[PDB]
Design a protein around this ligand. Structure first.
Ligand SMILES: Cc1cccc(NC(=O)c2sc(=S)n3c2[nH]c(=O)c2sccc23)c1C
Ligand SMILES: Cc1cccc(NC(=O)c2sc(=S)n3c2[nH]c(=O)c2sccc23)c1C
Length: 123
């Protein structure tokens, strides 16, 4: 209940990005989900996620998790626990976090709002 930001793994985004910590199972909130253009391939979803302290816009859902989005279990405001993820670095140096396994801990309807006031993580 109270102190809502205590529901989220504050500091997890920086740990994933600064340290590359991959054994953690962080609890994050979905801020927004959007499709990205893929031409002739199954849809891909990019997620803006929050750990309570920071937001990060470069999470990518593994396509095997697409049905969570299409059947609306995974939507803006929901709180989820990431169980398996990998970090990948692009040619230009940017990094993306691919979500492989996750569990929705609380529905968008049960949470209802963006938790706290996280700020964009830079790099
Ligand atoms: C839309 C879009 C736009 C630009 C690039 C890419 N793709 C990737 O950067 C890479 S690199 C790499 S190893 N994989 C992917 N993508 C994959 O899906 C799978 S599955 C098993 C491996 C990989 C995409 C998907
Ligand atoms: C849009 C977009 C843009 C840029 C990059 C990428 N993809 C990746 O960097 C990588 S690297 C890697 S190992 N995988 C992915 N993506 C995957 O989906 C899956 S599933 C099993 C492995 C992987 C994408 C998807």
């Amino acid at each position: 209940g109270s102190h809502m930001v205590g529901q989220l793994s504050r500091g997890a985004i920086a740990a994933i990005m600064q340290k590359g910590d991959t054994n953690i199972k962080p609890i994050l909130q979905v801020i927004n989900i959007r499709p990205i253009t893929t031409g002739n391939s199954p849809p891909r979803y990019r997620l803006l996620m929050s750990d309570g302290l920071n937001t990060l816009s470069s999470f990518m859902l593994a396509t095997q998790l697409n049905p969570l989005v299409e059947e609306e279990q995974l939507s803006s405001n929901c709180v989820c626990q990431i169980h398996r993820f990998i970090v990948n670095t692009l040619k230009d140096g940017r990094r993306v976090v691919i979500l492989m396994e996750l569990e929705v801990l609380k529905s968008a309807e049960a949470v209802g709002v963006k938790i706290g006031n996280p700020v964009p993580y830079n790099e």
